[PDB]
Amino acid sequence: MYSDQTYEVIKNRTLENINLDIYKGEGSFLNNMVSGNNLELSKIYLELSKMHKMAFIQDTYNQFLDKRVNEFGVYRKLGTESNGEVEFIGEKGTVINNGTIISYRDLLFVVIKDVTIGSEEGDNSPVQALEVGKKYNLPTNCEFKLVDNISGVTKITNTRSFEGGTDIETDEELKERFYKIQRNQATSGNKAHYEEWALEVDGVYNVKVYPRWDGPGTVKVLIFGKNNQAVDTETIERCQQHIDEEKPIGPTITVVTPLPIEISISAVMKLEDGYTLDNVKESFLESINTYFRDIRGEIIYTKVMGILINTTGVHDLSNLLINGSTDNITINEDKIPSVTTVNFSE
């Protein structure tokens, strides 16, 4: 094949192809005439070998992948510039106009809106990276410096870490993305495809589909917000129109939200010295909020009393009552406990 095809091999082949009166030998005129063209043909063979590699869908270059995805429509992502907010510290009344560029180390950043030092609007102004890339995602507490000197400005720092800086999508990543798109297509019943559209909303992070909730063909959409906290009504609505835009033909779709559950507690306890009711109350409510966040299933009485006694400032407690009972409280689905009444007596 192409590896076999070389200057010497095709030289011998062409010498065999030509039968003629004059003897064939090294250094002959016709020898050199054939040898030059055979070197050219070896170069052509190398080019034809590279034809195979460049024709293949794999190991393509930027332009090759660009053409393939333009045919396919899965356009490559160029990345997003980092965005953040910085604080300007300096002489009061200093006005920094739009378009001013600030440099931290060798990085370059630009200020979007005008900021005035000491003004009632504040000294914080959003700053967007000049170029895309994760290197522009500067962390918090970075001392930005003006590229151009401006009187009245002394120190610039960011109170929040810069975000949004994304690198250019490489060839391989788009390749497996396209492969996954080709293998899997949107389908009516597969809960992954349906919940994909719901998950596109940033407010919700867990989506559940309940088949056969109101008879055949009825799909109940269950969504969970940030740590299973109900999202606003507008979020529910907009998710509803979105999923309806991508819902299949002729379903009945209902969207539900987690329902907070009130919690009322009452106990008699002996407080340690140097500790008041407010301190133990706030510590225990924080601890029980964490427990409610991390609890799966029914409320456990003994976990509650253990986290209450473990609260600092509790020596002896008694008569612990939760919602009028000391038994385990069953939590229904899509419901989260919420502390509403605390009755602590010393």
Add this chain to the structure above:
Amino acid sequence: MYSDQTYEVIKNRTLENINLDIYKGEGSFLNNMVSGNNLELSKIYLELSKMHKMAFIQDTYNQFLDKRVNEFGVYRKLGTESNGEVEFIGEKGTVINNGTIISYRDLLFVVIKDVTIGSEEGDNSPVQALEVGKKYNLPTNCEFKLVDNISGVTKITNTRSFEGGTDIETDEELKERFYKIQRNQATSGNKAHYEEWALEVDGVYNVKVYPRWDGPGTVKVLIFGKNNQAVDTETIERCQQHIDEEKPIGPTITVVTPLPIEISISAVMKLEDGYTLDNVKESFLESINTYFRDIRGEIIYTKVMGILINTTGVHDLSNLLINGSTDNITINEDKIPSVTTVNFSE
């Protein structure tokens, strides 16, 4: 254009392009070297034409076609290995550990479960085929041989026929599936999409979809094996569970397999000299089998008589009956003719 340039045309062009005071004649040294260079150039042009064919992969099969099909999303279904259970007979107390190797003829099998002969867990252990292919779908009561000799083990037999050995994919089948998909204008939730889902399952050579067979929200799915044959219940279960994984939620899907039609043949036939009943019976069995493979519609009693008389060793026959009758029998949908009783006499 590679095809536009041909051997003699480019030879004459090369001869003409250079103006020579030397007369050009056949067999000349200049003519011989031009002929050799033209031969090499024609080889290059033929290689370029072959490369163009490979790029369009029209006739010849190569990795380019498979990779392009993978780009289009269709995947080469390698297949599944046959599964079954065998019985170990021998001295009580012998332990046959996991990974034990048993060989039947050329085929190789592996024991899946650690089985002890004479133990309370029984002497039967599941066995999976070590390679993909229909040849591993062994029938029941097959005698297996231990590759590694184990003391206290005498007989290895399977109480049931092995199943799950789907055939290995061939390039022709993949090309046909790609082509029929190319005619198919699929859509999320349409008969083409369901039949494509059926094509995704191993051993689904033919797909038949009947919408509204029971009316509201009902799909009738009919599948066939190779050459319009039946499919094992395991294949049907895998196909239906895969569909239910991807199908819309709510529709009722029924997947069935063709069932054979039993036939009985009775006739009085005068055998030729030197031919016994068994030989002519086997030859007629082969002839009727290939006729059934090549048949469509209904079994024709006249074709049966002709294929019996054309059998070697058959001199004079009489009172030929298929299922005791001389009338053609209709072969309905999802039904094939099966030979069950052969009655021949002289």
Add this chain to the structure above:
Amino acid sequence: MKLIDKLPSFDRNYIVEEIQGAYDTELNILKEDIDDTFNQLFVDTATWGLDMWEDILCIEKKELDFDTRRSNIKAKMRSRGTSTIEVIKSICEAYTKSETDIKVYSDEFTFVLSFIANNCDYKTLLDCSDMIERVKPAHLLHYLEPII
């Protein structure tokens, strides 16, 4: 000119120059053919290779334009699937040339389309129904209803 540079100095005669010039013209022809074939490899740069692209697509169409052929190839590949009801409604209303209301029950799995009988003819109604069934799911059943 390349080979004569590679060739020895004493072979700088006119015969060598002529023969190597012819060989260089052949090289130019070969390299432009290679470039043309490489262009034919890509869909956008292919001109006469689109016939086999269409053959692979298993659709046969009379030659109209190279750009039109490429657009048809791009349309044939993917670009399928009705995301929601509105896609089917918009596709069908082109055939019906009138507004269509839908009464779909999940329990019934039943689709119904109401349209003015006088607007859409019987034959084109049958063609639209066949196209819908080609698009409409196997379990679902679409009903064509002409308004009287």
